[PDB]
Write an enzyme that holds these catalytic residues in place. Structure first.
Site, PDB file in Angstrom:
ATOM      1  N   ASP A 165     -10.936  -0.314  12.506  1.00  0.00           N
ATOM      2  CA  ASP A 165     -10.039  -1.439  12.286  1.00  0.00           C
ATOM      3  C   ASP A 165      -8.783  -1.234  13.113  1.00  0.00           C
ATOM      4  O   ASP A 165      -8.225  -0.133  13.129  1.00  0.00           O
ATOM      5  CB  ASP A 165      -9.681  -1.585  10.802  1.00  0.00           C
ATOM      6  CG  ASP A 165      -8.535  -2.547  10.577  1.00  0.00           C
ATOM      7  OD1 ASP A 165      -8.524  -3.613  11.227  1.00  0.00           O
ATOM      8  OD2 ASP A 165      -7.646  -2.235   9.757  1.00  0.00           O
ATOM      9  N   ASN A 219       0.818  -1.207   0.000  1.00  0.00           N
ATOM     10  CA  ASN A 219       0.000   0.000   0.000  1.00  0.00           C
ATOM     11  C   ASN A 219       0.855   1.262   0.000  1.00  0.00           C
ATOM     12  O   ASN A 219       0.712   2.124  -0.868  1.00  0.00           O
ATOM     13  CB  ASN A 219      -0.939   0.014   1.210  1.00  0.00           C
ATOM     14  CG  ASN A 219      -2.048  -1.011   1.102  1.00  0.00           C
ATOM     15  OD1 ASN A 219      -3.178  -0.682   0.743  1.00  0.00           O
ATOM     16  ND2 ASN A 219      -1.732  -2.261   1.418  1.00  0.00           N
ATOM     17  N   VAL A 220       1.749   1.360   0.981  1.00  0.00           N
ATOM     18  CA  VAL A 220       2.597   2.529   1.177  1.00  0.00           C
ATOM     19  C   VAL A 220       4.024   2.163   0.795  1.00  0.00           C
ATOM     20  O   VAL A 220       4.468   1.032   1.026  1.00  0.00           O
ATOM     21  CB  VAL A 220       2.521   3.032   2.632  1.00  0.00           C
ATOM     22  CG1 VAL A 220       3.242   4.363   2.780  1.00  0.00           C
ATOM     23  CG2 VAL A 220       1.068   3.153   3.075  1.00  0.00           C
TER      24      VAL A 220
END
Lengths: 641, 636
Positions: free
Chosen positions: A131, A14-15
């Site tokens: 989450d 993702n990053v």
């Protein structure tokens, strides 16, 4: 095939991280996908704007986009920068071979204090993470202690992924309040204390939701034993690294955090609804004091207020243990006596709640003055149901994931026994240090008393010789001087008064008694303790950890079932050696306490002896002065004629 | 089938058979005769029966009477004779033990010689020659105090090493056939292996004995297979210097080829080996361990050798003068002059490692950390240079046994050095206790002097204060104020509190130094770990010697070489600490002997100081008495 955009060089996933090789800033850019849905695109823009607002220190903060980075963007939407943390996710720390049965006490305390104070700020801005996993919590190396930060946020309504940390409301997709975070925290905390997930270890959520709906609100751990029978236990399972009050307060807090109803979850019966923050702050602020009773060898934890008097807590200990305050002997790590009225909360004077908590230094040992010798047996340590069940039958070929758990528990028990042996050894060494201090003081007093006695003997001899010569010469002036029987009797009275005194024999008796005491003191001073003698226990612990690592090194194709004979053998050997060493420890402890009592018995003997010899010397000086005064007065009177 | 007949029951062996009595408890050994014998042999066996019946020497098995009623149970028509059973057993088992693989201990060899020679002389006196002698005939009967070596073919006037060449070449042998048979035997009692030709056939043995010179005693082949004749006594033997040298000369005198030259001593005529060996045994040997070099020197001392003369000889050999020589026993006992050097007193309560005397030097202040390692034989060095040499089993046995013996010798030397250091520490401790007692006495004297000075000054101050009132009324003749002021100014001079404090601090520092490393050595030793390594080696060495002939394969010796190197490294590491503590001990002993006369002179001065204080007080009292009496009686 490396590509850069100036000075910033690209790093790996993702990053994705970009580290500058000239300025030195590791900024983490979160890239956005190219195919966006309209509502999802609007929510992505909303998240971009929301990230600029949140800047809490205990969570990762949003950093400015570098100049010239929008040009190298496939999509027209701005990517966001962040701070890179060298520490890493909490999952790796939890999967370490040393934290298999939960983290240390200080680590859990810092985790709670760093996550709650950030979650309160998150809930204040009407933002819910929805989450939370150990993968989102990174341990950034701070200036003094490690800081728990939160990376990789999710979505939230302003006031869908892949993971096993789900609250029931995520399965029912019903109207959820902020409590969905609380639950996601509580389960996490469980794996931070015991080592395994609280609800259904590696079980699918399908039957998990039903078994959460069936359980009562007091039961915190829902698990199946070796046979496969479901169990709902309300107490915090073993082996945890917590003390008594910590375990009890955190069990009550866990019951308050694991509830089925959304509005009732987190509702504290003291701080209103959703008042878990203040309850946890009250739990953390509790100044806990650990006292090690050496007669039974048991650790007791007491909650002390900021200004709780020492005598009141000693009374509480007397009520619990059974030793009165007068016979209580509180000792520190080096034979240091506690402050006799200022509270003993200085035993944690550092007060920085070290991340590597060391309850083997912040404890105070307790000894008894009444008992002359101490018992060797201090009872063994309790063991969980799985450990006892596998000890009753070491030849049970259980599954790999069950064997992992039970072997980790056995290794943790062995390490705990080793720690207990170290604590007892340190306590005896501290008692010996106190005895050595008293022995040094008594030796100095012995030397002073010997000097005084020899000076008194010399003065008595000199005074007797002088008065004998005076009495001899008195009879030679009686023929032509001035004679009398008035002052002749005074010299004879002093001649008897000097025979009245004399403490040489008692002094000699005390000298041999003190010499014998000091010789036995140095005899048991020789005995070495600091370097763990017969360090068999540490090698057994090394064997246990090596075996545990070997079990976790076999690849997935070699994960076969077997028996646990060797580890049971190692545990029994460790228990036998532990008791064998503790017996010698308590033998030396009794040897030390009896001699300490003997020294405290011989102290007032010499005290009174010297207090009498002082007045004896005073009287000798007075008698000499009076004889000289009598002679001078007689001369002065005779000179009148 | 003739199992028992009466009280005497047969038990076991098949020449001689043992018979145990179920009422007396006596195991009599009957030598039975078989039935097919030649007549001349029959007359000779009757003759030997009678000859054995006459001889009753204590160092040989004696003949006992056959019990009444045994003539009926005889396989041969002539009476068989009884003998005495020895519970000890043959010398062969003692030689084959895993501890005596490299020869017997010194005391065992000395006792064997002293017990065999005194019996062989009496055997030769009665014109009786054994003609055969092997370790199987020599039994070690348990005696009253020490073990006695008894003996259980003869003409009256694998099985050839203990036989002399004059008998095995089918030649006419004289009594020297015994002498040679003794000389070989003693060799295996010292080195462990047979002296003449290991694993050689008897055919070439005669030629290889004819080829060797009379000086060469050991005939053996090395790892390659080259014959060698060495004249010196091979290593590793359990003998000291003079023992090894004198016994090597005696072995050369005992192992000769010519019959008339064998046993011919150039001092006691021909066949005078008995008295020469007696002279060897009677030599009072004294062992001195020089700790500066860590070497053992053995000296033979006659009945009237002066102590100073032997000290001069040691000074010439080692190099430390008689003044700087320090002879110490195991518990710090000095060799007091000039009683004879009876410390090697075997007649006392009581091995050359117990009657040993350590030698220290006064000149040297600190000792070196290394005293050099021990020499090793050629086979050991050759197998160390190449540990991966797969040699034959019987060669590997020899070299591994020699390596184990060397390790054990290193352990023994370490024990000797540790005992010497402990003895030095004990000697230092005695002086330390005496110095502590003297310190207490000196402190008592100093405090008494201080109290007396305080008392005197108080009294004289009061007297001076009262003197002023009398100086105003007429009766004051200042003819004696000089004495008063002199007393006041003179008693202040005495008082050595600072010097006493300095001496006390030095003595306390010395005592702390004494106790500092007192509990660092003890009876226990880290050398035990080396011994454990040695134990591993011997166990491995013995275990390989158990594999049967089908598993008797050749291999390398890597593990034993590794163990030997580890043992050497740990030995040097321990010796370093031993000598460090020895240097600390000798320096502290010298410090104590330096601080003794300081306190001696200080107390010898303080005694007279106390005397002078007492005299001055007595003079003041007499002065005041006389002045008052005369002045008052003048008026009347």
């Amino acid at each position: 095939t490396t590509q850069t955009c100036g000075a910033w060089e690209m790093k790996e996933r993702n990053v994705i991280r970009w580290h500058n090789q000239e300025t030195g800033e590791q900024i983490a850019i979160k890239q956005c996908r190219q195919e966006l849905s309209p509502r999802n695109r609007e929510r992505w823009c909303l998240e971009i704007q929301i990230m600029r607002r949140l800047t809490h220190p205990n969570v990762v903060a949003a950093r400015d986009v570098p100049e010239g980075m929008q040009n190298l963007a496939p999509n027209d939407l701005p990517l966001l920068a962040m701070e890179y943390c060298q520490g890493g996710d909490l999952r790796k720390y939890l999967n370490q071979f040393e934290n298999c049965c939960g983290l240390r006490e200080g680590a859990i305390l810092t985790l709670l204090s760093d996550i709650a104070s950030a979650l309160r700020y998150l809930h204040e801005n009407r933002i819910i993470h929805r989450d939370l996993k150990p993968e989102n919590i990174v341990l950034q190396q701070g200036e003094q202690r490690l800081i728990h930060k939160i990376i990789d946020l999710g979505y939230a309504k302003e006031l869908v992924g892949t993971l096993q940390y789900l609250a029931p409301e995520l399965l029912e997709q019903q109207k959820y309040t902020v409590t969905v975070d609380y639950w996601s925290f509580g389960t996490l905390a469980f794996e931070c204390i015991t080592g395994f997930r609280p609800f259904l270890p590696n079980w699918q959520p399908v039957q998990w939701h039903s078994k959460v709906r069936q359980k009562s609100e007091v039961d915190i751990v829902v698990s199946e034993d070796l046979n496969g029978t479901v169990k709902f236990s309300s107490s915090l399972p073993y082996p945890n690294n917590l003390n008594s009050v910590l375990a009890e307060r955190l069990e009550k807090w866990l019951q308050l955090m694991l509830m089925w109803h959304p509005r009732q979850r987190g509702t504290d019966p003291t701080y209103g609804p959703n008042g878990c923050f203040k309850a946890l702050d009250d739990i953390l602020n509790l100044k806990l004091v650990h006292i090690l009773n050496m007669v039974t060898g048991t650790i007791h934890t007491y909650p002390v207020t900021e200004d709780e008097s020492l005598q009141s807590l000693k009374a509480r200990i007397q009520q619990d243990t059974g030793i009165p305050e007068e016979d209580q002997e509180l000792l520190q790590e080096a034979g240091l006596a506690l402050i006799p009225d200022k509270p003993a909360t200085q035993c944690i004077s550092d007060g920085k709640l070290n991340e590597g908590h060391t309850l083997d230094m912040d404890l105070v040992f307790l000894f008894d003055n009444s008992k002359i010798t101490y018992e060797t047996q201090i009872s063994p340590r309790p063991q969980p149901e799985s450990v006892s069940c596998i000890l009753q039958e070491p030849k049970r070929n259980l599954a790999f994931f069950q064997l992992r758990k039970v072997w980790g528990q056995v290794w943790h028990s062995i390490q705990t026994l080793k720690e207990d042996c170290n604590r007892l050894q340190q306590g005896q060494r501290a008692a010996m240090m106190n005895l050595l201090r008293n022995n040094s003081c008594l030796s100095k007093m012995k030397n002073s008393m010997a000097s005084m006695s020899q000076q008194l003997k010399a003065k008595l001899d000199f005074f007797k010789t002088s008065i004998q010569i005076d009495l001899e010469k008195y009879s030679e002036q009686t023929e032509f001087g001035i004679t009398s029987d008035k002052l002749l009797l005074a010299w004879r009275e002093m001649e008897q008064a000097v025979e009245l005194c004399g403490r040489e024999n008692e002094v000699k008796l005390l000298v041999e008694r003190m010499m014998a005491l000091q010789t036995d003191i140095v005899d048991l001073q020789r005995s070495p303790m600091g370097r763990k003698q017969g360090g068999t226990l540490d090698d057994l612990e090394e064997q246990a950890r090596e075996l545990y690592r070997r079990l976790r090194e076999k690849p997935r194709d070699q994960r076969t079932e077997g028996d646990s004979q060797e580890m049971v053998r190692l545990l029994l050997q460790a228990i036998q050696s532990f008791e064998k060493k503790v017996r010698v420890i308590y033998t030396q402890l009794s040897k030390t306490v009896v001699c300490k009592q003997k020294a405290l018995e011989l102290l007032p003997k010499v005290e009174e002896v010297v207090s009498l010899m002082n007045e004896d010397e005073k009287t000798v000086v007075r008698l000499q002065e009076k004889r000289q005064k009598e002679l001078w007065n007689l001369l002065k009177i005779a000179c009148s004629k």
